[PDB]
Structures are given as C-alpha cells and as structure tokens.
Symmetry: C3
Subunit: 333 residues, 3 copies
C-alpha cells in the first residue's frame, strides 16, 4: 500500500483536531495513536468517584476525522501501568469485529490496525474484549467516535454544500455507580474491585449518572461550548451503549443526520433528534440569537438530575423580530 | 411590528381550536392566553391522586395552531392561587431558552412573550424554571404542543396536498407516583410536599403511570376519539420527557412525520412510529373500516397496564375485501 | 373471492419459507396455518425455565411471506391441550384490531381469518386477547412477523433492484422471569401460576432476559447464521413490545428500512438501526470479509449479559485492502 502518510495530533473532546471538509487530497494513510488509561476519576460535583477506562485519558475518546477512501492506521497502546486487556472496534470498519479481533493487547503491548474508510458518517469506536467485558469496558468510558467526511464536504441532499464554521464532539456516557446500604455511592480501589457490584447494577439497566465529556457540568462555565450569531456549528453526538435524544434549548437542528451517515440526506428543522445506542449522529445549527443555550438529552430527568446538560455561550446581537418580551413580568390586572 | 392581530379561543385536548390548513392570510400576530393551574387530580380508575401542574387546567396543555411566519404572542398567567414560579419554553421558538429565560413569573404575575414561527411542524412547549425544577414541572403535567402549518397546508413530498378532515392531539404523560411501605400509592397535600418522594422516584427513570390526556381511560367511552370510514384524521402525539411508540391497532400511519417537522416529507405506510422524548410527531390515517380501534404506545405493558390506551369509535360500512372472518370459531375437526 | 389458492409450508425461525422476490404471479389467496402451543421452555445456559406461549411452537412465531395484493388466509388453531384463550393481530391488516376482534378462540377451537395485503413491508403479528392479557401473551412469546413484498421485489429508491441471496428472521423477545428472596429465578407449574409474579415484574419495565430466537445463544454454534463473502443477506428484525437497536459487529446495514416499510426508500450505510417496540424492520448487507460476526442489540449490557447476541460465520477470502493487522501485538518500544 504505497500512499502518502499523514500524522494527526489528536485533541481532547469536545474539541476536534484540525481537518479539511472538502479536500483536493486523494486517499492517504492517516496515522493515529490511542493510549489506553485506566484511572479513578471524579464524575459529579458531590465528589463521587468512578473507575474509568479510557482511550487517550478522556471520556469520550477523541474524535478522529478522515475522508472517504482514506486508510486509518491506528497504533493502540496498552501501557504496563494498566491492569486489563483491551482492544478497539471501529463501527466505521469492515471485518474482524470492527478490528476488535485483531487488536486485543495485554498491558505492556501495542498493536497497529489499518482499515479503509469506505463508509461516510460519524461512527462509534469502542473497546470490546469479549463476553461480559464488552459492556463493562464501554460503560467504564472506553468509547469515542470517528468522522468520515465525503471528499466534497457535506451537502443538504439538494445539491448545496453545508459548511460548518466549527465542530464539537459531545460524547454521552451512561455510568453505573453502586450505592451502599445507607444510599451513598461506593468507591473502589481498582476496576477489578468495582466489577461485581457494577455488573449487578448494569444488568438492571438504570444508570446512576448520564454525563457529557465525562463529568456532570463538564461542558459548562469556563468549559461551555461557544459560538457567535451567524456561525454554523456541527454537533457530533455519540452514545455507545444507550439511546439519547439531543435537543438544543432555544435552537433547532437545522440539518440533522440522526442515524449519522452522510450517504443519507439530513432531516431539516428538528426540535429533538435520536441517537440510537451504539451510534453517533450529527446536527448542524446556525445560531440566530446570542445568550446561553443548554444542550441536553431531552429526558429532562437525565439532563437536570443525572448530569446530561452542556451549555453554549453565544455572542452577538439580539433579534427582536425572532423573539421579544412584549411585557415584562407584572401584577395580573 | 404593525401586522393584524387575531385572537384564538383555545380548547381542551384532545380537540384542537378551529384553524385553516392552506390559507390566503399573510402573517399575523396570533394571540394566546395560558393560565397556569396547580391542582390535585385523580389519574386512574383506583382513585390514585396526583399533584398536577398545568397550562390551562389540562394535561397536556392545549394545542396552539398557527402558520409559518406568524408571530405567536402568548400571555402567560400565574395566578396568586398557585405556589411556585413557572415559565414557558417553546421548542418552536428561537432564542432565550425557547422563551423560558423571558417568562419566569411568580404567583400573582403575568408576562407577554412573542416569537416568530420560522420552523414548521408540531413542537413541544413546556415549563422549565431552572435546575431540578425543569423535569419536575414537566412530569407534573406542564407541557403541551404547538403546530406551525405551511401556508399551503400539508403535502406528501411528491407535489400532492394532504388535507385532514379532523385533527386530535394526544399528549402522553409519564407520571411518578411514589408508594408507601405496604405498596399503596401515596397522596400529598401540596406539590411541595410531593417533591422529595417524587424526585427520588423520577431519578430511577420508571414511571408509575403512562397516560393520554391526563388519566387512565381519558380517551375511552364517552370520550373515545371518533371518525367515519373515508375520513383522514391527523393525530398529533407529544411526549415532553420520555420516548413513546404510537400505533393504531387495526390501522396504519398512512403519512407519518415521526420527528414532527413539515420541512421533511412524511414516511408512508407505517405500523408503529417513534416520538422521541422532548418532541411532537404527527400521523395521518384514512379510515377504511368501522368499529373500535385502540391507539396505544406499543410498549404493551405501558399501554394495557400503566394507562396508555385511547380508543377510536369509527362509523361506516365493513369492507369484506380488506378483511373477513372466513370461518367463525369452531371445534377443531 | 375467486382467486387461485397457494399453500405455504411454514418453517421455524430464523429460516424463512421459500418465496419469490419479484414475481409474475398475480394476487392469490395464500394459506397459512398457525397452531398455538403453551409450553415450559429453557431460556438460558443456567437452565432457567420460562412459561412460553407460542405460535407454531417457536419464539418468534414463523415469518410469513406474501406479495402486495395477496389475500392472507390464516387458520389459527388453539388445541384443547392449551389452557387459555388466544387470538391474532396482524399489523399488516386493516380492521377489527388487526384481526384480533375476529380470532378469539378457546382451547379446542380454530378460526379462519383472511386479510388483504395492502401495505408493503415487514410487520409484527401477535396475540392480543384483551386487557392486561395483551402484554402478558406477547412477552410470553406470542409474536412473529409477516413480510409483504412488492411484486417487483425490493428497490433502493433510485430505480435499482435490491435482490437478497438469503433472508433470516431474528425475533427479539423481552422476558420477565421473577426471582425468589435469595435471588434465583423462579419456576412455575403453569402460565396461570406464573401470571401474578410475572405481571408485577412486567410493570417495572426491566426484562430479566433479552433473547433472539427464544433462548440465550440460540443463534450461535451449530445454529450460527451463515453467509459467504459476496452474498447479500436480508435480516428481518422484530420486537413486539420493546425497542431494540440492531448492529452487525464488523459490518453495516447497507440498505436499512428501520421502520420496516417498503413504500419508503431504505437508508444507506448505517452502523446501528432502531426497531421501535411493536414493529419489524429490515437491513440488507453484502458481506465483504470472512470470519465471525456478532449481530446484537447495541445496548451491550442486553447483548452480552441478558442474551441478545447472534453470530454469523462467513466463508470466503480475507480482504487486506479493507482491513489489515499492520503489526501484531508486541512489547511497547
Ligand atoms: O447490625 C447487624 C444486622 O445488620 C444487617 C443489615 O440489616 O447487616 C449489617 O451488618 C452486618 C454485620 O455487621 C454486615 O456484614 C452487613 O453488611 C450489614 O448490612 C443484618 O444482616 C444484620 O443482622
Ligand atoms: O414496627 C417498627 C419497625 O418497623 C419499621 C419498618 O420495618 O419502621 C416502621 O415503623 C417506624 C416506627 O413506627 C416508622 O417510623 C417507619 O416509617 C415504619 O416503616 C422498622 O424500621 C421498625 O423497627
Ligand atoms: O424466618 C422468618 C422471617 O423470614 C421472612 C423473610 O425475611 O419471611 C420468610 O419466612 C416466612 C415464614 O417461613 C415465609 O413465609 C416467607 O416467605 C419468607 O420470606 C420474614 O417475614 C420472617 O419474619
Ligand atoms: Cu477495554
Ligand atoms: Cu459496537
Ligand atoms: Cu412550572
Ligand atoms: Cu424542552
Ligand atoms: Cu395468546
Ligand atoms: Cu400490536
């Protein structure tokens, strides 16, 4: 395979490494490295801890971006400082359980997998060692996404280009933290110690936490998403294990691929869309109003009470044609 | 803004205020009033009670109908007889958290919000005061829907008009009523008294009841939906917090916008469709057979055991070509 | 009704009785027989038992295949060896609650129902006796599917024929097996004895098991699905009561009707699709790589821990262009 090689410097979510939308490049071998990290992390503002397992130290794993017909060559590294075997399954790839059957590595090993990007869209990647370890590694945080863009960039299905000014990747994580007898979340010394209680809870199908970017409030305050009025923002949303229903409070999905695959035309003008567990989808919105937006899953219990709220802070001029407070709050006459 | 004003007299669900589909009117300011009512109601045939919070006294709130490019001017009233602050978020609107950031009113106040109907479809509206109150007010009943019709009426995406003979609005409500130690549903003196137990249950994500129009059996008996053979009926379905999968038992969705947005062509000939939590969708069906139909969510446990069944009673002539009982029940030979 | 009659010999899932895709036949009366069987079965590799109720002895019931405009004439038989009344509701049919209102039969009876296949697609059929028996009979196993093909066969919505080399029917079943005090699954002497505990669990909406073809591991080992590289396989998936999110691990859905209705064009290039509870959908894939695939619902907890995994064993030549292990596992440098 005698194609040009291109290295990518991955960046932590919700940001996305620099890339072209439309490109004049032909196929390349695009090189990525992912280093697995098992680590205890804090997942809420109460200080609850969690035995996480991650690609590149983040939940979600970073977004990888290539174009249709590229070859994606991933060096997956499992340092000796980890305790368990791991692998990678790319839903964008064809064969060998998405790559999982070719990438199982013990602590102290690395492996190099290449796959041809024959399907466009956004796709989940995740660890999948075998058997009951599959769900456990995924809900412990071992999932991310890859975006395979058409070489001509995105289109509306009507002949028009859809160019985004910026893209964010929102990875949603269902987490299963057990409680003790008096009702407090438990803490564990190792993922292995957490396994028995965690699996018992997993099988009951109700998460304790549903978070974006690994933690309650991760995408708020200093780390709010941003935009300006007039900017077209692409929001990639993934969920490797469980359904979600994204919604931009005060906005819309102007163009939405809820099944996430660019061979299909987008839907237009959505209020709320649906990410099937085990998939990524994408929504584009051109901001029209400044101020705070919340980006949620629209199970509002999940959003407000279990962790699944991000914010956008948007700069620009208020549009009184689109909305106005005709009369401020006043005593009823 | 010097456009003509038009008042609407809202009507309680499942009925819909009179409106045009295709219209020769240009944009107007369409005036609506919603008066919040907190009230204890009965939600099942056992007499279980529920601390409801409502727009205009109903669950769901009434369906508002306008056309693309209208301005929707809502007077939201929170009488002093209520206990809590409330607001309104229109998923059809652009800016200020759907209007929620411009409509927070204490008991004794009213506010007037106007928004431009730039997106077509059916959309959820709901209360959203802030924080954990968001889910609580919504699952207490504070949600309804708005329909923004194209000025040319509905179409099939193939150049043909789709005209409905009547429309019904089915609002589905997930309810969380706690149980005491011996397993009976609890009753509370106020919404505030219900809050702690109700939130604890909410976070476990399993409703005690799933109802249409506020109560088990609301859309049955005297209050069954009706049609005649040959009539095209539009069924708007909303769910502000939780997924649903509508199905007309003995019928179909001839034309379905399950994401609910009229810029997209309908799907055809569905058995069951999917309303994402936080959205409204719509289905049209031309009745072909008389008799009783059930309209359900097709989690049949929810439908038959938790409350989520409506009936249609349909008049007309039986069509033996479409279905016939060739041989009535008889002893096996 | 003076049309030619054609008998079908049904075959147990996941296989499908022989049929034409495109056909030069005109409408016929296609005759099917379904004999209900109530039976205690084993559903997992631990030996857990289950009070099943079935059409033709299988979970799911067998796939029936006809063409648009055929008349489907079903003899439904409820032998005296059963204990309960049963009926059948075809989501493909128009009128009388899908046929349920014309097919209620006591043990010792049979009934003959005919319906005209006016809607194309894959559709659920299920028992629906009335009231709380509806969900109970369905989650006890009394559901299957029917496929109504266009007379010209399937198409891509772009003028091209889509011909499958083989079809499999995967019926997914949510099961509710109660546990005793010490946490073991309970066994019952009759469906009636199982009812009280089973309904109590049903209403909590969390299954104990989620299986394909009636049992954990049913579609693995000797009974793995099969294909060859180059074969186009249609996978019909149904779920009569509860959502699912199918995914072919190492493959894709090349053409997917997730709402299952052939009047709509398929989506292309999906990773994971969505079967709404109360529906059947279908996905076509042309295999490109040999080896083992898993076909799952992509709630991976359900897939790996509750029973919902099938395998494909695929023969043919490995394609190193599409995927290659560039470097086998090795010590990190
Ligand atoms: O106080 C003993 C009494 O408490 C229970 C819980 O209801 O068990 C608690 O105490 C045990 C002995 O200290 C612990 O092992 C156990 O984990 C804790 O729940 C009863 O089982 C016991 O009779
Ligand atoms: O009978 C007392 C015994 O019952 C429990 C429940 O198992 O508590 C009940 O009685 C308490 C005292 O009357 C109530 O406060 C409580 O709400 C009720 O559940 C035990 O905790 C107690 O030992
Ligand atoms: O040992 C009696 C004590 O056990 C409990 C369960 O905590 O009930 C068990 O024993 C009863 C009498 O044998 C059984 O009927 C019951 O089904 C079983 O759970 C207590 O209720 C009882 O005090
Ligand atoms: Cu892993
Ligand atoms: Cu996967
Ligand atoms: Cu409120
Ligand atoms: Cu909302
Ligand atoms: Cu039955
Ligand atoms: Cu049904």
């Amino acid at each position: 395979l005698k194609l040009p090689r291109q290295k990518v410097e991955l960046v932590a979510p919700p940001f996305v490494h620099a890339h072209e939308q439309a490109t004049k490049q032909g196929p390349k071998i695009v090189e990525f490295k992912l280093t697995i990290e098992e680590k205890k992390v804090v997942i809420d503002e109460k200080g609850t801890t969690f035995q996480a397992m991650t690609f590149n130290g983040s939940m979600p794993g970073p977004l990888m971006v290539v174009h249709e017909g590229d070859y994606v060559e991933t060096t997956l590294v499992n340092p000796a400082t980890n305790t368990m075997p791991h692998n990678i399954d790319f839903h964008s790839a064809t064969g060998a359980l998405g790559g999982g059957a070719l990438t199982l590595i013990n602590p102290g090993e690395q492996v190099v997998l290449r796959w041809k990007a024959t399907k466009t869209g956004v796709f989940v990647y995740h660890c999948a060692p075998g058997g009951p370890m599959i769900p456990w590694h995924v809900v412990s945080g071992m999932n991310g996404a890859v975006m395979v863009l058409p070489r001509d960039g995105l289109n509306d299905g009507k002949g028009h280009a859809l160019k985004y000014d910026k893209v964010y990747y929102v990875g949603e994580q269902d987490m299963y933290v057990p409680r003790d007898e008096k009702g407090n979340f438990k803490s564990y010394d190792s993922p292995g110690e957490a396994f028995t209680d965690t699996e018992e809870m997993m099988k009951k199908l109700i998460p304790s936490h549903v978070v974006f970017n690994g933690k309650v409030g991760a995408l708020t305050g200093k780390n709010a998403l941003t935009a300006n009025v007039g900017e077209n923002v692409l929001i990639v949303h993934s969920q490797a294990n469980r359904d979600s229903r994204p919604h931009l409070i005060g906005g819309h999905g102007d163009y939405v691929w809820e099944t996430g695959k660019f061979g299909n035309a987008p839907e237009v003008g959505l209020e709320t869309w649906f990410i099937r567990g085990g998939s990524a989808g994408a929504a584009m919105y051109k901001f029209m109003q400044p101020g705070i937006y919340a980006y949620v899953t629209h199970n509002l219990i999940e959003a407000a009470d279990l962790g699944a709220t991000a914010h956008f802070k948007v700069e620009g001029k208020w549009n009184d044609d689109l909305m106005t407070q005709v009369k401020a709050p006043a005593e009823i006459p």
